[PDB]
Motif scaffolding. Structure first.
Motif, mmCIF file in Angstrom:
data_model
loop_
_atom_site.group_PDB
_atom_site.id
_atom_site.type_symbol
_atom_site.label_atom_id
_atom_site.label_comp_id
_atom_site.label_asym_id
_atom_site.label_seq_id
_atom_site.Cartn_x
_atom_site.Cartn_y
_atom_site.Cartn_z
ATOM 1 N N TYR A 26 -8.196 -8.729 -8.948
ATOM 2 C CA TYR A 26 -7.450 -7.611 -9.394
ATOM 3 C C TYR A 26 -8.021 -6.482 -8.247
ATOM 4 O O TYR A 26 -7.541 -5.451 -7.814
ATOM 5 N N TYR A 27 -9.559 -6.621 -8.118
ATOM 6 C CA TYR A 27 -10.142 -5.810 -7.046
ATOM 7 C C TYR A 27 -10.008 -6.578 -5.767
ATOM 8 O O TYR A 27 -9.522 -5.840 -4.828
ATOM 9 N N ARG A 28 -10.500 -7.827 -5.430
ATOM 10 C CA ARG A 28 -10.757 -8.406 -4.202
ATOM 11 C C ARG A 28 -9.409 -8.593 -3.418
ATOM 12 O O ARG A 28 -9.455 -8.146 -2.104
ATOM 13 N N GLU A 29 -8.365 -9.136 -3.981
ATOM 14 C CA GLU A 29 -7.115 -9.350 -3.308
ATOM 15 C C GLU A 29 -6.475 -7.777 -3.183
ATOM 16 O O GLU A 29 -5.573 -7.773 -2.148
ATOM 17 N N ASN A 30 -6.688 -7.033 -3.888
ATOM 18 C CA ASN A 30 -6.200 -5.581 -3.705
ATOM 19 C C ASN A 30 -7.015 -4.665 -3.019
ATOM 20 O O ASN A 30 -6.485 -3.454 -3.055
ATOM 21 N N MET A 31 -8.124 -4.951 -2.524
ATOM 22 C CA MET A 31 -8.874 -4.019 -1.438
ATOM 23 C C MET A 31 -8.263 -3.099 -0.676
ATOM 24 O O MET A 31 -8.643 -1.964 -0.671
ATOM 25 N N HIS A 32 -7.183 -3.511 -0.144
ATOM 26 C CA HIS A 32 -6.264 -2.652 0.961
ATOM 27 C C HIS A 32 -5.523 -1.691 0.120
ATOM 28 O O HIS A 32 -5.190 -0.561 0.759
ATOM 29 N N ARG A 33 -5.402 -1.790 -1.166
ATOM 30 C CA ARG A 33 -4.746 -0.515 -1.914
ATOM 31 C C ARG A 33 -5.856 0.520 -2.260
ATOM 32 O O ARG A 33 -5.505 1.248 -2.737
ATOM 33 N N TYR A 34 -7.017 0.275 -1.999
ATOM 34 C CA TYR A 34 -8.218 1.172 -2.163
ATOM 35 C C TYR A 34 -8.775 1.701 -1.037
ATOM 36 O O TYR A 34 -8.723 0.820 -0.072
ATOM 37 N N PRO A 35 -9.434 2.981 -0.885
ATOM 38 C CA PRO A 35 -9.842 3.336 0.684
ATOM 39 C C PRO A 35 -10.788 2.568 1.410
ATOM 40 O O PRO A 35 -11.661 1.972 0.455
ATOM 41 N N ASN A 36 -10.986 2.748 2.389
ATOM 42 C CA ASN A 36 -11.868 1.893 3.307
ATOM 43 C C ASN A 36 -13.180 2.991 3.697
ATOM 44 O O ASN A 36 -14.113 2.626 4.498
ATOM 45 N N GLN A 37 -12.725 4.229 3.708
ATOM 46 C CA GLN A 37 -13.653 5.517 4.077
ATOM 47 C C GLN A 37 -13.766 6.427 2.648
ATOM 48 O O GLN A 37 -12.959 6.205 1.885
ATOM 49 N N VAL A 38 -14.746 7.258 3.008
ATOM 50 C CA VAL A 38 -14.765 8.462 2.110
ATOM 51 C C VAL A 38 -15.067 9.674 2.780
ATOM 52 O O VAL A 38 -15.538 9.781 3.631
ATOM 53 N N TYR A 39 -14.549 10.736 1.992
ATOM 54 C CA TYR A 39 -14.515 12.282 2.576
ATOM 55 C C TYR A 39 -15.840 12.940 1.672
ATOM 56 O O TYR A 39 -16.152 12.574 0.646
ATOM 57 N N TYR A 40 -16.499 13.835 2.555
ATOM 58 C CA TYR A 40 -17.687 14.184 2.123
ATOM 59 C C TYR A 40 -18.162 15.768 2.609
ATOM 60 O O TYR A 40 -17.398 16.041 3.651
ATOM 61 N N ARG A 41 -19.329 16.248 2.336
ATOM 62 C CA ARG A 41 -19.987 17.270 3.330
ATOM 63 C C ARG A 41 -21.491 16.407 3.313
ATOM 64 O O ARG A 41 -21.874 15.580 2.697
ATOM 65 N N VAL A 66 -2.302 10.927 -3.566
ATOM 66 C CA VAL A 66 -1.255 11.771 -2.942
ATOM 67 C C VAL A 66 -0.656 10.773 -1.834
ATOM 68 O O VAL A 66 0.480 10.535 -1.759
ATOM 69 N N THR A 67 -1.352 10.358 -1.034
ATOM 70 C CA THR A 67 -1.049 9.238 0.092
ATOM 71 C C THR A 67 -0.387 7.889 -0.379
ATOM 72 O O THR A 67 0.452 7.350 0.306
ATOM 73 N N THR A 68 -0.774 7.473 -1.502
ATOM 74 C CA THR A 68 0.088 6.428 -2.262
ATOM 75 C C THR A 68 1.441 6.944 -2.666
ATOM 76 O O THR A 68 2.488 6.432 -2.702
ATOM 77 N N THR A 69 1.603 8.150 -3.496
ATOM 78 C CA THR A 69 2.626 8.561 -4.216
ATOM 79 C C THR A 69 3.835 9.136 -3.150
ATOM 80 O O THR A 69 5.056 8.787 -3.278
ATOM 81 N N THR A 70 3.589 9.680 -1.892
ATOM 82 C CA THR A 70 4.395 10.020 -0.793
ATOM 83 C C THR A 70 4.955 8.871 -0.122
ATOM 84 O O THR A 70 5.935 8.831 0.301
ATOM 85 N N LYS A 71 4.516 7.802 -0.544
ATOM 86 C CA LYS A 71 4.767 6.299 -0.057
ATOM 87 C C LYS A 71 5.334 5.553 -1.504
ATOM 88 O O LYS A 71 5.724 4.254 -1.079
ATOM 89 N N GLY A 72 5.625 6.400 -2.466
ATOM 90 C CA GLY A 72 6.170 5.509 -3.613
ATOM 91 C C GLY A 72 5.542 4.463 -4.190
ATOM 92 O O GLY A 72 6.286 3.629 -4.552
ATOM 93 N N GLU A 73 4.303 4.369 -4.112
ATOM 94 C CA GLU A 73 3.264 3.561 -4.805
ATOM 95 C C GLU A 73 2.864 4.261 -5.897
ATOM 96 O O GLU A 73 2.826 5.622 -5.998
ATOM 97 N N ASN A 74 1.887 3.513 -6.638
ATOM 98 C CA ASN A 74 1.360 3.883 -7.909
ATOM 99 C C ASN A 74 0.208 2.920 -8.298
ATOM 100 O O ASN A 74 -0.308 2.267 -7.486
#
Length: 104
Positions: A26-41, A66-74
């Protein structure tokens, strides 16, 4: 608003445990549903780790949702748990790397 921030180039994914072998996929197969970068200062002006990570998680998990829900994912509640932890781990990583290069 992320013009006033930094964004890390693509990161490692850690292999976070959760409590079922079901969740390992549910994590490993799904990795692409979670970000590969993070925003910061950076550590410049904002030398703390606590509110640095908590706000990185706020910014990144919001923006990514937001980037998920604007593509109608959850996302499931478990998906938010992973997201939060990966995003924290990736933020900790970056901050520890730049902090070490400051602590020297």
């Amino acid at each position: 608003g992320l013009g006033g921030y930094m964004l890390g180039s693509a990161m490692s994914r850690p292999l976070i445990h959760f409590g079922s072998d079901y969740e390992d996929r549910y994590y490993r197969e799904n990795m692409h549903r979670y970000p590969n970068q993070v925003y910061y200062r950076p550590v410049d002006q904002y030398s703390n780790q606590n509110n640095f990570v908590h706000d990185c998680v706020n910014i990144t998990v919001k923006e990514h949702t937001v980037t998920t829900t604007t593509k109608g994912e959850n996302f499931t509640e478990t998906d938010i748990k992973m997201m939060e932890r990966v995003v924290e781990q990736m933020c900790i990583t970056q901050y520890q790397r730049e902090s070490q290069a400051y602590y020297q």
